[PDB]
Amino acid sequence: FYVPLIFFFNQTPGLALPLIALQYHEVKLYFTLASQVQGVNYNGSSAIA
Amino acid sequence: VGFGNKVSTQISRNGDLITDIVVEFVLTKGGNGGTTYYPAEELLQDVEL
Amino acid sequence: ATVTTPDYGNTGTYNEQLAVLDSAKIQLNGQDRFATRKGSYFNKVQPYQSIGGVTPAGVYLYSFALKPAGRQPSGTCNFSRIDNATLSLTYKTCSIDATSPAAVLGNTETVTANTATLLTALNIYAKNYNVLRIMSGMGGLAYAN
Amino acid sequence: AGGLSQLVAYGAQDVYLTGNPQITFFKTVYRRYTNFAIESIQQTINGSVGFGNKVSTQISRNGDLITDIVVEFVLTKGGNGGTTYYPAEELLQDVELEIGGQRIDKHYNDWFRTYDALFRMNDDRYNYRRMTDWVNNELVGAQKRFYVPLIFFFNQTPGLALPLIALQYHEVKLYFTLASQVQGVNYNGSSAIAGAAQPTMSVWVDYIFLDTQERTRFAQLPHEYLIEQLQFTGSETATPSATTQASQNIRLNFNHPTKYLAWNFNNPTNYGQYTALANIPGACSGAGTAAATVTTPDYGNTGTYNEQLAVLDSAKIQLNGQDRFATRKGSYFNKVQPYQSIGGVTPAGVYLYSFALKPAGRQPSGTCNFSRIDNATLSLTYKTCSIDATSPAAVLGNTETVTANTATLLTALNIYAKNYNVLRIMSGMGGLAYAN
Amino acid sequence: AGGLSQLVAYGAQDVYLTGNPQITFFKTVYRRYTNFAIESIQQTINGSVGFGNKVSTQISRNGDLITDIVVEFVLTKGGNGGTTYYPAEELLQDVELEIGGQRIDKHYNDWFRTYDALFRMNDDRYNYRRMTDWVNNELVGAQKRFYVPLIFFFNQTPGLALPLIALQYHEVKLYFTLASQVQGVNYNGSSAIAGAAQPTMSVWVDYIFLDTQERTRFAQLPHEYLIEQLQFTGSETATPSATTQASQNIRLNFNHPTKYLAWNFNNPTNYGQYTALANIPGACSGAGTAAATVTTPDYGNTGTYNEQLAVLDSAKIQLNGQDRFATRKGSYFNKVQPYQSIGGVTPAGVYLYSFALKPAGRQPSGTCNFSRIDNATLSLTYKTCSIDATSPAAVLGNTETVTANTATLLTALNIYAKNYNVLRIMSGMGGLAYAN
Amino acid sequence: GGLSQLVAYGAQDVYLTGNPQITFFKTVYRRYTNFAIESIQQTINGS
Amino acid sequence: QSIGGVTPAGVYLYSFALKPAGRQPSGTCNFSRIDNATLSLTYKTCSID
Amino acid sequence: EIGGQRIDKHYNDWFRTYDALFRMNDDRYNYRRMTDWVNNELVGAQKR
Amino acid sequence: LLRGFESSLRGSRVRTQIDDKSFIPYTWQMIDVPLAAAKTSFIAGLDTRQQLAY
Amino acid sequence: FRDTASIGFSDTHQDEKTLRFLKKQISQFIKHLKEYYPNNELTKKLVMKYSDVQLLPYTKGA
């Protein structure tokens, strides 16, 4: 699966984030993953062994 | 990486500007047909810049 | 059901498990142009990113352009100057018995149907820019190669 | 009597030997060096370690120069004796060397075997095997710590150590791609070994701390290093079973002033197998007994020196449609070029042609700049794979133009090129001077 | 902590190692070189190729300098496994170098074996064996291509490449004498092998192509090369049977600055047999079982490291009536001289004594000028040859001054001396600087 | 033959074959102080 | 790294030098100026029959 | 670690020793609360 | 238009257009801050520990 | 004695160059549209595309 992000710089090139102009600022992404995913490890609230 | 886990990444400064970002998942379903609903999307619980 | 003859009117599908490509990479002069990507990337992600439509399974695109669907030039790979352009393919293992839907609907992306060995023709297209010049009733291509 | 009886034997031809002496052999001169210390420091590996996983490290600036890097692995053997063949290195499919966002080099598991096959010799080959394998008839359940030293251009000689003190802005990273299949640990042939343990790894980096007068010089001056790179693409082979010796003409995609070209013919399933399997001692599992099979190697002896089981009959390098040298037989590249250029022994199935007088060294000594060649092609002639691999009477009793029928499994050809380039570093940033 | 701590402890003992630094080990500066390319080209051999024939080849001047020559033979083995012992070199009976009609050097099959035996070492000698023998237990009828690299002053280091570009008035050619008897190919001992195939022979030469600026200089400027050459005449041994230790005084016929002398005691019928045969594993045909016979070696293992099968007890070299050194036992010259001088292992029956600190090198490091010595002799003492070769209890369980009765078969003596000369090239003609 | 390689002098090669400093095919040897080597026996004092 | 050979089991080396096997000085620790130089060992449990 | 130089290094037994030596009363008890189960919790209980 | 046009002929497709040129003006940033190398004793320590008199 | 003045491999008359030769010629003549030039001006192109030599002057005396 591929889940594209929909932030300000993600859909149009005109707002592309210039790392080149951020020489001294590192850009980080935080990702929180769900504990329960329907049909994968839970069916409703019941865990899938 | 895993269910309920929180991870981060630091965008490697390989280029000049950043446009789209695509997060990919490999999932195996444990249910039958019609028992899932955008499982990659809910797995992606949140994203922070 | 005869798995050697399609239900022709519904030949086109979106089921990736029936698609051949496991992965692809474009290499220019012995150097990778990007790291190898899995086949679903070329079937679904770039069409979303740069076109905005839906591509059926088995059809793949890689773009060099921001708007490959448009007429406005938006990024090009000039193959008139590249000595070697190679498209590297990786195939899926064609081990699934096509007659058993429990297997065809219940496997991973690295395998496909045994009937896949019938897809014997590889058609790779490139679409590009040149300039058509017109002078005093005569026309012609300024860049022909 | 003695030495005084010889000193007197002075004649006209000695003006070329002892005339107007310039050097005396018995009172030598040493050169004092900038004070330094070497410290081995652990790095932090990002990602999940395991079979088929891809992990990387960001090298901490623990010092002024960086030189030796060793990657350790802990593996548990899942089989009995003779079932492994360098499992420590095959576990590590590749290593990417990145300085500031730009890749400088990349090595492969198979390259490590090829490099070892060509350029290491004697006690270093044996030690390397000790560092990467089980060599003492260890049994199932044995577990040990393995060391896989890296061979990037800056990893074998202090003379090319990278100046981290001058790389204060750009980071240096190593990406490690691990194998999903490791013979004798995780898989036996293509059969999974139940209960196989996941590997544990750590990356050891040896830092050098300099004294004041030189370290501030390094951060003061721009630097240019004459470095090595590896180039690699894979090829498919054409190996006939009978009646003909196939030809193949592979168009090469190499650039830069190249030191040498090396290649091997392999069975992609059995790591390090560069020859045909046969029912002779050390050439296949069970060889010499009723249980012998020529589909499975006697893995602890995968490598051999018996070229009879090798498939290359002849090869030549053709540049722009004209041959680079007259056609040589496969044994020239296996036996003679490494004799002339390295001074070691190359096992059967690995082949080397040099452009350099001393490709084993780092002193530039002749190159082929392939960026100037319009058509760079490696032409191959294969041996005919008609010899019954299970009949020693034929396997060891045949002609120069034929090999075992099991040689048809050597479907992949890995062609490596080693070349010079220049690395530029200044104002905390680095990158490759000539692209590709 | 760490490396900084080591740098902190800087005091008086460091002033002569690091104070006022002159070098660093971490910023090595390479030298830039003249553009050249290497090609291996085959020539035409004049003469019929075969057992016992003499052939020669003129080196087609396809380049500016000649750096190496590899002779290739194709042989079919006429016997079973273990019946050959360096057959490509036995066949290569004698190679003579001619420049301008004058003999420059000569190397015999026994010299190749002696050089291999005591100067070539490591995996490099194993690989050498791979090039000249059957090393994988091959069977009768097997066909193998063999490579015999030549060892003339110019063959191992490019700095002595033959300046053919500057020899436009002279031919450079070599003469090849091929042996009539090759063990395991057309003879087994003294018995002919019916149906044995005639060898196929080619000679390959590695040509250097120089660029515009350097080849101009080489063609126009005079040159002088400081080179090595081999002096040799064969002689006869004085091996006793029982009750005595024979003495022999050999009048030497060597001249020019000699870097070492080396010799072996051989059985002229069995190529490479420098020791006595005995009923010990690998010491004779059938050794270890009832079929053991001590008149014929188990040829594939003709060479041994067991000095008890060597015939020499002691040796001394005397110059102009006064001893060059006090008498040493044979094991000194077999075990210690090569340890001190070259750092390798010499098999039993082959002996060295050096004048050079590094006789394996080209840079002069001590010579004995035998052109200003009027009478030089080699004094030998032989072991008593009373031990019954067929009883390992008697051969493996005895003292130093005795050997096997079969040592009396070592009837031929080969004394080699290598020395310096200078090859002058002037007005398009080459020649030697010093005569005799 | 090898000429197809030899001719290929380029911009990158200024670091290798440009402005040559050394030659590999003409070595110059250094002349040394005249000496002779011998090994003789010492007397060992003691039982 | 320091020699280029193989050392048999039970024999151990730690170098302060780049080429300890050579004569040319290539890195040293001067133990005349270290007050407390200690080698700390951990032994294997010798439990195998 | 500050710039490649080690400044300090604490082990688990040092933490125990420090808690044993310098933390006193409510602070040691609240420390216990932060690092252990202090209410007779049973198998499966999970805490931050 | 028909015979005086431009095309790509071998020799004009030579790999040196990459192998003679760097990626350096394409991958490097613009960093105005100087490098901060300084004396070793400032970080390492001052060796204050009673060294032996000779 | 041999008397063979020519060395014996490709050097002096052979112009052993790679096809990059094309860009050298374009540069010499300046325009990328090379096709029309030798059709109209051949002499200048031939004059500028060949090699020089070096001589060997040695003797011994009568």
UniProtKB/Swiss-Prot annotation, chains D, E:
Task: Summarize induction of expression.
Answer: Expressed in the late phase of the viral replicative cycle.
Q: What does the PTM comment of the record read?
A: Myristoylated at the C-terminus. Glycosylated; highly branched oligosaccharides. The pattern of glycosylation sites are unusual.
Gene3D superfamilies named among the record's database cross-references: Adenovirus Type 2 Hexon, domain 4, Major capsid protein Vp54
The entry's cellular-component GO terms read:
viral capsid
List the GO molecular function terms.
Answer: lipid binding; structural molecule activity
Q: Does the keyword Glycoprotein apply?
A: yes
Residues with glycosylation annotation = N279, N301, N398, N405
Q: A Pfam family this protein belongs to?
A: Capsid_N
Q: Which superkingdom?
A: Viruses
Q: Where in the cell is it found?
A: Virion
Q: Which UniProt keywords apply?
A: Capsid protein, Glycoprotein, Late protein, Lipid-binding, Virion
Additional observations: The viral capsid possesses up to five major capsid protein variants. They behave as asymmetric capsid components.
Give the family per the record.
Belongs to the NCLDV major capsid protein family.
- Functional description taken from the UniProt entry: Major capsid protein self-assembles to form an icosahedral capsid with a pseudo T=169 symmetry, about 190 nm in diameter, and consisting of 1680 major capsid proteins trimers. The capsid consists in 5040 copies of the major capsid protein (hexamers), 60 copies of the penton protein (pentamers) and 1800 minor capsid proteins of different types. The minor capsid proteins form a hexagonal network below the outer capsid shell, stabilizing the capsid by binding neighboring capsomers together.
According to UniProt, the name of this protein is Major capsid protein
What organism does the record attribute this protein to?
A: Paramecium bursaria Chlorella virus 1 (PBCV-1)
Curated annotation (Swiss-Prot), chain I:
Membrane-spanning intervals of the chain: none
Induction pattern? Expressed in the late phase of the viral replicative cycle.
Q: Where in the cell is it found?
A: Virion
Annotated S-S bridges: none
- Lineage, top-rank taxon, reads Viruses
Subunit description: Interacts with the major capsid protein.
Its job: One of the minor capsid proteins that constitute a network internal to the major capsid proteins and outside the lipid membrane. The minor capsid proteins glue and stabilize the capsomers.
Q: What is this protein called?
A: Minor capsid protein 3
UniProtKB/Swiss-Prot annotation, chain J:
Q: What is this protein called?
A: Minor capsid protein P4
Tell me the first and last residues of the signal peptide: none
- Please verify whether the record's keywords include Electron transport: no
What organism does this protein naturally occur in?
Paramecium bursaria Chlorella virus 1
Recall the taxonomic lineage recorded for the source organism: Viruses, Varidnaviria, Bamfordvirae, Nucleocytoviricota, Megaviricetes
GO cellular component, as recorded: viral capsid
Origin superkingdom: Viruses
Q: Where is this protein primarily located?
A: virion
Subunit info?
Interacts with the major capsid protein.
Q: What keywords appear on the UniProt entry?
A: Capsid protein, Late protein, Virion
Q: What induces it?
A: Expressed in the late phase of the viral replicative cycle.
**Record keywords: Cell membrane included?**
no
The job of this chain, per UniProt, is described as: One of the minor capsid proteins that constitute a network internal to the major capsid proteins and outside the lipid membrane. The minor capsid proteins glue and stabilize the capsomers.
The chain's disulfide connectivity reads none
List localization entries: Virion
Gene from which the chain derives: A572R
